[PDB]
Design a protein around this ligand. Sequence first.
Ligand code: UGJ
Lengths: 17, 349
Amino acid sequence: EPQKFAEELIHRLEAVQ
Amino acid sequence: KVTTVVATPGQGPDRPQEVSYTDTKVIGNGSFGVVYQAKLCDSGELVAIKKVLQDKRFKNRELQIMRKLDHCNIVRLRYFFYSSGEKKDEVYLNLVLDYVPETVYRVARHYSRAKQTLPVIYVKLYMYQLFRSLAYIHSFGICHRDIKPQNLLLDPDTAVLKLCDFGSAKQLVRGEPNVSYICSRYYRAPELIFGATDYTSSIDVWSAGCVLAELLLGQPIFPGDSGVDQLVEIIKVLGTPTREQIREMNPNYTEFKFPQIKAHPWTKVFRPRTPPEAIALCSRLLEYTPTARLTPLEACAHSFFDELRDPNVKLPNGRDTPALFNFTTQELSSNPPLATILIPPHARI
Ligand SMILES: N#Cc1sc2nc(N)c(C#N)c(-c3ccccc3Cl)c2c1N
């Protein structure tokens, strides 16, 4: 769960910058 | 069509009495079960009635909480009673509440549709009254958890605000799990989004800040579709949280990559006319570290509300302000010396 969620979060930040 | 029931006073002596009402109209859907409007035959007063489904095998949490609360800024439980119906086989719990005509949501939407912002004087009045109710319930260890514009009821004439709907409220204690998927996404604390089970009453404070910002902005400050996009909107403003902040929210995320993103300046967030103290209050409400957020009582004493402590302050309709100074010992239990500020000299004796 924790590593899983952080991976789809970190992706949407590469898209914001 | 007049209905007569045997109701029990909400905070009262626990002696049931006969109560008659009429003019049953639907207001809308509460947290669990729908909310009706009605008129008491005796007084002629209007009341709200939230009918909820009750299971006979355990006690109703909302009812337990509601019987404790008496506050000018919270919708009061007049009576409660039981009924049956809807395929039967079960019992409904009916909560008889104060009726209040308006919501902050409806008012905020009324200004936004006219391409305008709510005058700061109302923002001060409404937020201050919200923080008072928050200060009151948190002193029992009770977290509302639903805080949002829709649950902030208003009397337009008197400018009185009343927090409502405790169907998601819980009494928090150290060492117990709580659902991290709670509140409403726009007003959801970041630690909740991280799935933290350890959170405190500070989550309500976060939500309050979201409401404050929205009233300043004219739109929800943290929009977005998924629960994960919510976190994106937050860091697009607050900036990527430090390791130490992640630790304070959910320790299980302490070591992770998390690309560094610059915080967008609070002054560039709001319109140029936005009061400085409004910006300072908002910045102290919204923090990643829950312990860093202001307590509701501390918020009440913030410089932003200094205009409410002016002996000459009035409503835009010429009427006096509601009672802002009426704090009890329970309200001030978190920080009694704060009364030096909270209760102005003109309201002392
Ligand atoms: N518990 C509880 C009560 S009493 C009450 N009274 C109201 N006037 C209103 C309104 N509007 C509401 C309300 C608020 C948000 C969403 C839906 C509803 Cl019905 C409630 C409400 N949820």
